[PDB]
Design a binder for this molecule. Structure first.
Ligand SMILES: Cc1cccc2c1[C@@H](N)C(=O)N2
Ligand SMILES: [Cl-]
Ligand SMILES: [Mn+2]
Ligand SMILES: [Mn+2]
Ligand SMILES: [Zn+2]
Length: 457
């Protein structure tokens, strides 16, 4: 009645042995957690990263949020509070809203109340929050390196796999090997919460994993949907709020919304919940929709990552983006080829999985090139796509980031289409077209062979 909490998501308590390697651990829980989309990970009791900061010297620009269900909000873009003044505002808000000591409101009640107030148009509650990548004004909650002497305890956690700053540059996240500037994806985001500040339903760019660590404060309440129910959820969303689905003019205009999990559960979409408390991790799996809100003043840090498991999903995702005409954050094929070009220094399990994705890439590329030849495109020239800014190598039709090949035409200088959209570039006859390609098929097979040798198969 009014609000029925979804079932709880898995909670894992790894021993220090299991916890040592995050990628091994994530792989182990994967068959369980991917059925629920999110899961929680409680570190061993003696895993306490040192959090220390001056609350008066950390400052940030607050973002403002209206709280209406099904109302469109924009995904956060890449006034001023200090952490102390925000904290004071946030505690006062919650304390005044409930007329209770700010830390005495039951989590059950805030949740019930959150879903009441987002559904009631008579109640125009607005809240504020912080969201940004680390900077000089507000840095990572985890120990980093620079011109400040670290204690032996901080040095212990400097190189932890669970220090989210390390997640990008680690040798089991294929995002590490990307040389392209994708700071939005590789760098951790910092989130300063207050009561009811919320993140709308979304999945991660390129269907990556995400991992969220609650450093300090009141809990963060989560809802998660498993990857297999993604399109099921999207169907429901289109039905009740189709306005969210009109084509986005940019990646800076992605529309997302708050929507009651009971509404989803009513339409047979599986939904799980959890309250993430301070010192706990939440992990989201590929294409797992998730949303949530903060119980009160808190501080979280989150980062994207991609394991070898993800590679085939990454390819499927870029295909899905093409159908939707959605912009890519990076070129997936460019990443695969970058890794192939470094086959000798690759982890051997990585090499093996990259090899299989590369084989699919090459076979798809072979067929596409045969098709455009049959359309009468004859002229061709090698082109170093990776040197072009992304906005200079998107298919004018489906907006995909080109890398393996594209079609150009002297009639339309600087414009390109991917090989799926040869007809869409201009009205000139195809013999005026040019296939621009990064590699010949003859360059590609040896790159794939290097992977095979490194995989030792
Ligand atoms: C504010 C915001 C936006 C998008 C994702 C996330 C947040 C956070 N409050 C959080 O923890 N994840
Ligand atoms: Cl409202
Ligand atoms: Mn308190
Ligand atoms: Mn997310
Ligand atoms: Zn295209």
């Amino acid at each position: 009645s009014m609000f029925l909490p979804p079932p709880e998501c898995p909670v894992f308590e790894p021993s220090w042995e299991e916890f040592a390697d995050p990628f091994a651990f994530i792989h182990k829980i994967r068959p369980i957690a991917e059925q629920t989309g999110i899961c929680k990970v409680r570190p061993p009791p003696d895993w306490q990263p040192p959090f220390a900061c001056d609350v008066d010297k950390l400052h940030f620009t607050p973002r403002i949020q209206r709280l209406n269900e099904l109302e469109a909000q924009t995904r956060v873009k890449l006034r001023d509070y200090t952490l102390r003044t925000f904290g004071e505002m946030a505690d006062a808000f919650k304390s005044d809203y409930f007329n209770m000591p700010v830390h005495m409101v039951p989590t059950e009640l805030v949740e019930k109340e959150f879903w009441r107030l987002v559904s009631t148009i008579e109640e125009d509650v607005t809240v504020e929050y912080g969201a940004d990548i680390a900077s000089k004004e507000f840095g990572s909650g985890f120990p980093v390196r620079d011109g400040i002497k670290l204690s032996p305890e901080e040095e212990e956690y400097l190189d932890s796999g669970w220090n989210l700053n390390n997640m990008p540059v680690m040798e089991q996240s294929v995002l590490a090997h990307i040389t392209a500037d994708i700071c939005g994806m590789k760098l951790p985001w910092l989130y300063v919460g207050m009561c009811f500040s919320s993140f709308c339903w979304h999945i991660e760019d390129h269907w990556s994993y995400s991992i969220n660590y609650l450093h300090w404060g009141e809990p963060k309440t989560w809802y998660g949907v498993p990857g297999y129910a993604a399109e099921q959820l999207e169907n429901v969303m289109k039905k009740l709020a189709p306005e969210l689905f009109v084509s986005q003019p940019d990646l800076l205009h992605q529309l997302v919304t708050i929507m009651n999990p009971n509404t989803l559960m009513t339409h047979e979409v599986p939904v799980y919940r959890t309250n993430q408390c301070a010192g706990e991790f939440v992990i989201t799996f590929p294409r797992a929709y998730h949303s949530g809100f903060n119980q009160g003043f808190n501080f979280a840090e989150a980062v994207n990552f991609c394991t070898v498991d993800w590679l085939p999903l990454g390819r499927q995702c870029v295909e899905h983006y093409r159908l939707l005409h959605r912009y890519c954050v990076f070129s997936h094929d460019e990443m695969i080829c970058k890794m192939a070009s470094k086959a000798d220094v690759l982890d051997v399990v990585v090499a093996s999985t990259v090899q299989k994705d590369m084989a699919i890439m090459i076979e798809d590329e072979k067929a596409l090139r045969e098709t455009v030849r049959k359309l009468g495109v004859i002229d061709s020239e090698r082109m170093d796509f990776e040197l072009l800014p992304d906005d200079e190598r998107q298919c004018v039709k489906c907006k995909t980031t080109c890398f393996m090949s594209a079609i150009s035409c002297s009639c339309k200088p600087g414009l390109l289409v991917c090989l799926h959209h040869v007809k869409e570039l201009c009205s000139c006859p195809p013999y005026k077209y040019k296939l621009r390609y990064r590699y010949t098929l003859d360059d590609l097979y040896p790159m794939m062979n290097a992977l095979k040798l490194r995989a030792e198969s």
